[PDB]
Design a binder for this molecule. Structure first.
Ligand code: ADP
Ligand code: ADP
Lengths: 506, 507
């Protein structure tokens, strides 16, 4: 119909929970979006799988309905290019010629490989693994899952050996189906497999040896984030025939592009159910001394030195707000904002909210949630505030660890997203204790945003990264530290003591 | 009007902190009638706590006169045979011996204006010699530091003590003085709560009075035994009571031991109310505590009798931990606490050291705070509520294990329990397990007025022997025996010990 010309960028965000499509214009407004859940298959405990075909069929459905919606509004709809971003680590093995999965996707959240990680960790110098791949052995990354498949599945062992299978992360799987055969990954995804030399950006021989990948040609070419990943040829999305796929990045790194985290000492934190952090380390490979992850932030082109990052997680810290709600200590999450406005301090109350142990730098799985310093005067308010403060303290320990390893004194910025960022009193406390400028982005959808940006740069939609930079840096709330260093030292040491009581062996 | 025949009764007066109660017991110890009246709890500035001695007296006369009218409007021949007095202890009044005017309000045991003096006097004296003399260290609760404060900030009180025309009395003395229009008496149990009595010889102490500026020892009432003739009622305020004998007198906590039939060594009572505190009968042995608990007099029936002794321990306002769960929405009603301990068999590793006001005896750590340990995302209101309740039991067990170690015994004969936490049977059962004791909950709520009726009736020979009353008094309404093996007790109390360690370790 009637409304004229419309040039768009398709950004696909294939998430854990669902599949999203965003149609961006070249000013980076969302002209249209939709999404579709897929089933989160948890068979026995610790298992977590996806139907790779369900995901693909959801994707086609979304692509086809989006373009009809756009074409029913505008006169000349042009989809210029396609950006792909995705749940990392999650792995599929399939048949190179029919494209049938030889098994479901095994999601990053899956832990059936826990016993193997223990075994292989007892046998190998985890220190040499960290130098090679940027991380110790773990249950999240793809390799131990690829291994489990090789060990409990004769067909997968055999078609890996004969060279007629493909081992792919979700991006590879998306691009292979859309282009009817192309076998690619990018640097950021490749870095989440346990198979890639973190220094040379190549599939690693010794790592594959460790993991029984006997034939290295089943692994897709590692491309850079901007690159030609092929043309759409699928007959499932007829309107998209011959449209170029031109950006590809893992979700967490995509959100760094959406948050314009481009230079060293620039960092982004998500405060959702999970609370985790990425610090851009410039062109320097920094290895952590406290067990945090060395990753690839991005590499735009083949000529570029890649930019590196450091990664840290405090698990599902935002679920401590759900736990206050279960125990009636608040009635609505919004009440947490209210409480931290009214309540200036906790009157000496400290909450070490280690419900699942303490993560980096301490690494203590045996730590539990502990509240200290209460009197008859203590109220829901004080306990709720302490919990929230306990989240900030954990986060500060990670920042103080990563910044110590990087040889810097302070973060340039911490760009923040997720639902806890609606709490401004809480944002302010994080700024105080960490000693950092905190900016909350203008955009919710920083993850799809980064893939659109990458895809648009590759086809030269904008004339330079600087053109997009100032668009991307728009903040919606800004925070500077209002706490003196003497008071920071005093509080974080009261925290340290409370963590000591929590951990001392008796 | 009044046609239901003959009625012989014992009057029991319970002059409490909060109010004044009258109980008319028959000689089967049924309550034929009771009534009561609040008096004002005066908290001027912080730490201060006073009563109007006249308001109390006037409440008492009002209750006495309305009770007897009620009885006389029902019965044909009402006979009030004797009167028993029990009372809030430690609370002190100084008055004029001849007019009976108070020279100042009563200063309630709960009052702490004397805190600086206790600190001073404690820096100066061997608190160890004080304990041997009086059964306790210096404190803000007992009468002497309040009598002292009065002497120091009040020239009239200093002067009329010096010249011999004033009386220093606990609430019993005050009651008996006004009722009999002049008699000046106390009993052994009240005397023991003044800081002025030799805990061994039952005499007012010279040296202790020296310490406290009681320059003239004749202002102190004669120490009587618990059964004794305290005088006849002569007051014209209660005309119907003229010439009725006052024949029992005891401090409230010791009266409850009499009502709970706590007569032999190794027999103990615990109250689980807002406050949670314990008394263990030590037989005829004066046992001094090695952990700062109080050596007191349980009772002495007659002048010929060797007194029976007790040990006393308090965990402060532990029952208020249940109010704190309610403020923080962790339960909706105290009754939900019983429900929770039925359903919830354990706390899945969760421990609550409920030290809201610090830890009392044996540890004595004012710097301890309330602390909760061992939680995961799976922890629920139930687990925290049960942990708190279990934390109360563990504190109590430390006190029992202290007192029993000083007494040279291995186990309590019984623990007779009262208060509203005793409606929670799963909680009573856990205390029985951890402390390792038989727990009996009495048939009677009103064990405090019960004891004074018993004492008054024995004095006038209403019953033929203490054994006559004993079996009546020992009626229980619930009984608990330990269902926990000693290996599990050792494992739990040692997990508790470690949690108290984390709470207290200095960093
Ligand atoms: N006003 C608030 N104050 C503190 N925490 C909040 C507030 N609102 C939401 N949260 C927490 O934020 C998380 C939800 O944020 P979101 O980013 O949508 O989660 P997810 O990462 O699961 O998508 C939950 O942990 C929730 O309890
Ligand atoms: N079912 C119960 N479980 C646990 N505690 C209870 C229960 N019912 C009442 N309580 C507590 O008992 C105390 C009240 O008992 P009571 O002996 O009447 O108090 P007080 O000593 O103030 O007169 C309060 O601490 C109250 O919260």
């Amino acid at each position: 119909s009637e409304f004229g010309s419309m040039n768009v960028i398709l950004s696909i965000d294939q998430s854990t929970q669902s599949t999203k499509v965003f149609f961006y214009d070249e000013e980076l407004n969302i002209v249209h979006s939709n999404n579709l859940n897929h089933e989160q298959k948890c068979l026995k405990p610790g298992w977590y799988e996806h139907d790779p075909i369900e995901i693909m069929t959801n994707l086609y459905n979304l692509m086809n309905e989006g373009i009809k919606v756009l074409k029913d509004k505008y006169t000349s709809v042009i989809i210029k290019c396609i950006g792909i971003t995705n749940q990392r680590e999650t792995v599929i093995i399939w048949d190179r010629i029919t494209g049938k999965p030889l098994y479901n996707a095994i999601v990053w959240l899956d832990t059936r490989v826990e016993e193997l990680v223990t075994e292989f960790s007892a046998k190998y110098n985890n220190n040499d693994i960290q130098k090679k791949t940027g991380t110790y052995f773990n249950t999240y990354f793809s390799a131990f899952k690829i291994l489990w498949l090789i060990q409990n599945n004769p067909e997968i062992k055999q078609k890996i050996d004969d060279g007629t299978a493909v081992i792919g992360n979700i991006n590879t799987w998306l691009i292979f189906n859309l282009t009817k055969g192309n076998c690619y990954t990018d640097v950021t995804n490749a870095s989440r497999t346990l198979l890639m030399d973190i220094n040379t950006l190549q599939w690693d021989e010794k790592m594959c040896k460790i993991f029984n990948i006997t034939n290295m040609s089943v692994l897709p070419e590692i491309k850079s984030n901007c690159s030609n990943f092929g043309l759409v040829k699928s007959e499932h999305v007829p309107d998209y025939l011959n449209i170029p796929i031109t950006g590809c990045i893992g979700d967490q790194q995509s959100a760094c592009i959406g948050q314009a985290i481009f230079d060293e000492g620039e960092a982004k934190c998500t405060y959702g159910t999970g609370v985790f952090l990425l610090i851009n380390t410039g062109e320097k490979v920094v290895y952590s001394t406290c067990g945090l992850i060395t990753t690839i932030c991005y590499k735009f082109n083949d000529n570029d030195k890649p930019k590196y990052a450091l990664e840290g997680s405090i698990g599902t810290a935002g679920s401590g707000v759900s736990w206050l709600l279960k125990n009636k200590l608040i009635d609505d999450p919004s009440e947490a904002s209210d409480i931290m406005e009214k309540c200036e301090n906790t009157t000496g109350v400290i909450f070490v909210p280690a419900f699942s142990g303490l993560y980096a730098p301490r690494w203590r799985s045996d730590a539990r949630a502990s509240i200290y310093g209460m009197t008859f005067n203590t109220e829901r308010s004080h306990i709720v505030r302490a919990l929230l403060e306990g989240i900030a303290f954990q986060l500060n320990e990670i920042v103080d660890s990563l910044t110590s390893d990087m040889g810097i004194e302070m973060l340039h910025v911490l760009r923040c997203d997720g639902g806890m960022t609606k709490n401004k009193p809480f944002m302010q406390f994080n700024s105080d204790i960490i000693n950092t400028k905190i900016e909350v982005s203008k955009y919710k959808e920083v993850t799809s945003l980064g893939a659109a940006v990458l895809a648009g740069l590759e086809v030269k939609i904008w004339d330079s990264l600087d053109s997009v930079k100032s668009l991307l840096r728009r903040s919606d709330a800004v925070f500077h530290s209002k706490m003196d260093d003497k008071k920071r030292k005093k509080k974080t040491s009261e925290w340290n003591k409370a963590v000591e009581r929590t951990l001392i062996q008796l």
